Design a protein around this ligand. Structure first.
Ligand SMILES: *[C@@H]1O[C@H](CO)[C@@H](O)[C@H](O)[C@H]1NC(C)=O
Ligand SMILES: *[C@@H]1O[C@H](CO)[C@@H](O)[C@H](O)[C@H]1NC(C)=O
Ligand SMILES: *[C@@H]1O[C@H](CO)[C@@H](O)[C@H](O)[C@H]1NC(C)=O
Ligand SMILES: *[C@@H]1O[C@H](CO)[C@@H](O)[C@H](O)[C@H]1NC(C)=O
Ligand SMILES: *[C@@H]1O[C@H](CO)[C@@H](O)[C@H](O)[C@H]1NC(C)=O
Ligand SMILES: *[C@@H]1O[C@H](CO)[C@@H](O)[C@H](O)[C@H]1NC(C)=O
Ligand SMILES: *[C@@H]1O[C@H](CO)[C@@H](O)[C@H](O)[C@H]1NC(C)=O
Ligand SMILES: *[C@@H]1O[C@H](CO)[C@@H](O)[C@H](O)[C@H]1NC(C)=O
Ligand SMILES: *[C@@H]1O[C@H](CO)[C@@H](O)[C@H](O)[C@H]1NC(C)=O
Lengths: 216, 95, 115, 323
């Protein structure tokens, strides 16, 4: 709903498109005005040079018309080629986003826009395309004491995915991009090395799923 | 300096943002002409004996001043044209 | 040579004000409320120590905006707002809540074909 | 470039003739401004992707990873990391000569000191906050617990770093040191930048020297030609100057357009790296430079940017029968 309010009053967000349409009609205009320029010849009307003079003179003048206009094309043309490539690279980027962002999920960061990317919805626009990027942005944070490792018996325990954290007492392992604390058991953690090497390992006790299951 | 922006923008509503309109150059208050005899044009042009073209006479002339006025005020001369530089202007530009 | 560079008319939209601040580019404020900049001689905008977001880009960090009665101002652009992350050996901050934002992104594809 | 003043140097005689070519004079400014505008858009896209300016904490404990090399130097008047000074010395009259004829060098919107604040921010958040500052509010995380992730990114289980940390510290630091001499002892590393700056100053020289060419005209000096040649005939002469010079601009302008379109492509490559490589961790093989990529450190350089890619390259092999 916010998108439609933005567009309702936003002329600028389409500036990229509106500029492209402009710049063409601009050079198109200027291309036309160049038909009114003398270019040094006695007039910018083709015939009015003729009927004024006997043609063996017009052959001279019409040069300065042709030499002028022919140039003004090659200016305009060479523009378009350059401008075409500019769109060309933009079109390649659109194909890349259309391919990767919409048809996939882009692991690339900030290629589909700020935040982790979920999906995109393309929308046509005159001489262009408009993606609606649906991105996952985290919000509320909580300062939390952490440790890279946890001793248990002298073995070291590291999280499979996520990190050991603690509010201040009970050590919890949680996934990284969302706060979802879970008690620390072997299914959370794998064993490597021992307690000497890690810098920042704490003590603690990693609960065992299996041990209670035995007792009966 | 504001109205010129409307002409450059070609729109009675000039939207926000900076626009280059025109360039201002300081005008020169006044002119300095700083030049550092008489040249024998009465001895060349009223001379009594010109040689032919197989042995034409040549006279290197410098260190004097040009009387270019009466050259044009002579007006008894059949064919008088100046290549590149125009004769009337050459009064003051010198050599 | 002449000061040159170019005249530049800094304006809020004509809809907001008819007042403009002229920037003479790359010159000395002699040959012209005046202020000297890095980018040239600026006229008609009151220098403001308060550094804010860059709004109308001028040059070399000088950025002008309309607001305060009101007058066009000129000030050193603050790049961003300032933050200092509170950082320790074991300090971590894990997001507990999040948002789903839809950010429009717009690209040209084709341009008007001509012959 | 001032088209009217350049072509016709302080002469109305020539200036009036230029009006007969119409919009050439104006459309050149419209052309060059398009360049000049997006240049500060390039520098905008690349460097400032970050909402806030982060700054490093007062005290540096990263687990052994020295950053005093790459972090802003608190004792310089313009705060720029020790490395960046090596760069600004390598890269480099043309100061007013061009500026005689209407060839102007406009100041880049962002001063170098500002560029060094961005590349401080991006580098301040990268160190403290991991990669999350590109996705939202920066999240302080222990740097040594950052590098446990960036190994999981490349498939090396984090238990390698928690055990090898001290070693990895030295390899990092000793790697940073050689970056100094790599720059310090050889001036060809910056050729890419150096080539850009030269080619710009190149064409300007060429563009200027075109003022002194006859182009078939009797004299290259416009004021001398107007003063000596008769107005009737001198008209045709000044054409060959104008036609020559006016063409000679379109040559220069077209070059800039083409050349800028290259930079415009290179800028996106940076903005792509800056976003993916610096702000995130790249899975694209050899996009961030040879090896598995861990993190990247942006560093500013004149009209350019320099990345320090910290990459993970395996070493010693052991033949082993597999199944
Ligand atoms: C953590 O504490 C610091 C202390 O300055 C504070 O600035 C920051 O906002 C706190 N963050 C959270 C997640 O509460
Ligand atoms: C952890 O527990 C051990 C005994 O198992 C004790 O010696 C040590 O001081 C405690 N604290 C630390 C730093 O591990
Ligand atoms: C001027 O802009 C405001 C919004 O800032 C708008 O409400 C108003 O209608 C505009 N007026 C004109 C003259 O367009
Ligand atoms: C010109 O500008 C310079 C540098 O800002 C300044 O020192 C000088 O006083 C100004 N006036 C003159 C004399 O050009
Ligand atoms: C603003 O900065 C100028 C710099 O010259 C200084 O003179 C002036 O006193 C400052 N004003 C305030 C209130 O900070
Ligand atoms: C960080 O290290 C310093 C110096 O060893 C120590 O004084 C401080 O308590 C440590 N903080 C934490 C929470 O690890
Ligand atoms: C996050 O904030 C929103 C605000 O509406 C709230 O509805 C939501 O319940 C919060 N998170 C959770 C998990 O409740
Ligand atoms: C980093 O290297 C510099 C080199 O002078 C040294 O002075 C500084 O103490 C080192 N810092 C660390 C944390 O090793
Ligand atoms: C493995 O054996 C081959 C053949 O003998 C040898 O070329 C290669 O260097 C050996 N590699 C290792 C890891 O020893």
């Amino acid at each position: 709903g916010k998108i439609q309010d933005s567009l309702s009053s936003t002329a600028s967000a389409l500036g990229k498109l509106q500029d492209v349409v402009n710049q063409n009609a601009q050079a198109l205009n200027t291309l036309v005005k160049q038909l009114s320029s003398n270019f040094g010849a006695i007039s910018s009307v083709l015939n009015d040079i003729l009927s004024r003079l006997d043609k063996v003179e017009a052959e001279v003048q019409i040069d300065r018309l042709i030499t002028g206009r022919l140039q003004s094309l090659q200016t305009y043309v060479t523009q378009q080629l350059i401008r075409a490539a500019e769109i060309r690279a933009s079109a390649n980027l659109a194909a890349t986003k259309m391919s990767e962002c919409v048809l996939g999920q882009s692991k690339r960061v900030d290629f589909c826009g700020k935040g982790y990317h979920l999906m995109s919805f393309p929308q046509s626009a005159p001489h262009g395309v408009v993606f609606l990027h649906v991105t996952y942005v985290p919000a509320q944070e909580k300062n939390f004491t952490t440790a890279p490792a946890i001793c248990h018996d002298g073995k070291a325990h590291f999280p499979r995915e996520g990190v050991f954290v603690s509010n201040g007492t009970h050590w919890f392992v949680t996934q990284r991009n969302f706060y979802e604390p879970q008690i620390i058991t072997t299914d959370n953690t794998f064993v490597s090395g021992n307690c000497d090497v890690v810098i920042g390992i704490v003590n603690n006790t990693v609960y065992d799923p299996l041990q209670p299951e035995l007792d009966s | 300096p504001l109205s010129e922006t409307k002409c450059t923008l070609k729109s009675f509503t000039v939207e926000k943002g900076i626009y280059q309109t025109s360039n201002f150059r300081v005008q020169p208050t006044e002119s300095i002409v700083r030049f550092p005899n008489l040249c024998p044009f009465g001895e060349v042009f009223n001379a009594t004996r010109f040689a032919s073209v197989y042995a034409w006479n040549r006279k290197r002339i410098s260190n004097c001043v040009a009387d270019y006025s009466v050259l044009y005020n002579s007006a008894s001369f059949s064919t008088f044209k100046c290549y590149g530089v125009s004769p009337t202007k050459l009064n003051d530009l010198c050599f | 040579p002449c000061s040159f560079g170019g005249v530049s008319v800094i304006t809020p939209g004509t809809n907001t004000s008819n007042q403009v601040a002229v920037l003479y580019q790359d010159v000395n404020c002699t040959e012209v409320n005046v202020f000297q900049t890095r980018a040239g001689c600026l006229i008609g905008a009151e220098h403001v120590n308060n550094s804010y977001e860059c709004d109308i880009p001028i040059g070399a960090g000088i950025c002008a905006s309309y607001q305060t009665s009101q007058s066009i101002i000129a000030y050193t652009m603050s790049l961003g707002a300032e933050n200092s992350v509170a950082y320790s050996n074991n300090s971590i901050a894990i997001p507990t809540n999040f948002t789903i934002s839809v950010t429009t992104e717009i690209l040209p594809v084709s341009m008007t074909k001509t012959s | 470039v001032d088209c009217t003043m350049y072509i016709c140097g302080d002469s109305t005689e020539c200036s009036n003739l230029l009006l007969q070519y119409g919009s050439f004079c104006t459309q050149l400014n419209r052309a060059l401004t398009g360049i000049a505008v997006e240049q500060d858009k390039n520098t905008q896209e690349v460097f400032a992707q970050v909402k806030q300016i982060y700054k490093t904490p007062p005290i540096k404990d990263f687990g052994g990873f020295n950053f005093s090399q790459i972090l802003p130097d608190p004792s310089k008047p313009s705060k720029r990391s020790f490395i960046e000074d090596l760069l600004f010395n390598k890269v480099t009259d043309l100061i007013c000569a061009q500026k005689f004829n209407g060839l102007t060098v406009l100041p880049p919107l962002l001063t170098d000191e500002m560029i060094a604040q961005y590349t401080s921010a991006l580098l301040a958040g990268t160190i403290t906050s991991g990669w999350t500052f590109g996705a939202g509010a920066a999240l302080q995380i222990p740097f040594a617990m950052q590098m446990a992730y960036r190994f999981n990114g490349i498939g090396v289980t984090q238990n390698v770093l928690y055990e090898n940390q001290k070693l990895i510290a030295n390899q990092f630091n000793s790697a940073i040191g050689k970056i100094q001499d790599s720059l310090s002892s050889t001036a060809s590393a910056l050729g890419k930048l150096q080539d850009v700056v030269n080619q710009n100053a190149q064409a300007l020289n060429t563009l200027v020297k075109q003022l002194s060419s006859n182009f078939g005209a009797i004299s290259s000096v416009l004021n001398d030609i107007l003063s000596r040649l008769d107005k009737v005939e001198a008209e045709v002469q000044i054409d060959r100057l104008i036609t020559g010079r006016l063409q000679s601009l379109q040559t220069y302008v077209t070059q800039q357009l083409i050349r800028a379109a290259e930079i415009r492509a290179s800028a996106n490559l940076a903005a792509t790296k800056m976003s993916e490589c610096v702000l995130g961790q790249s899975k694209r093989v050899d996009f961030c430079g040879k090896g598995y990529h861990l993190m990247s450190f942006p560093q500013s350089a004149p009209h350019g940017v320099v990345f320090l890619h910290v990459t993970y390259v395996p070493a010693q092999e052991k033949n082993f029968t597999t199944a």
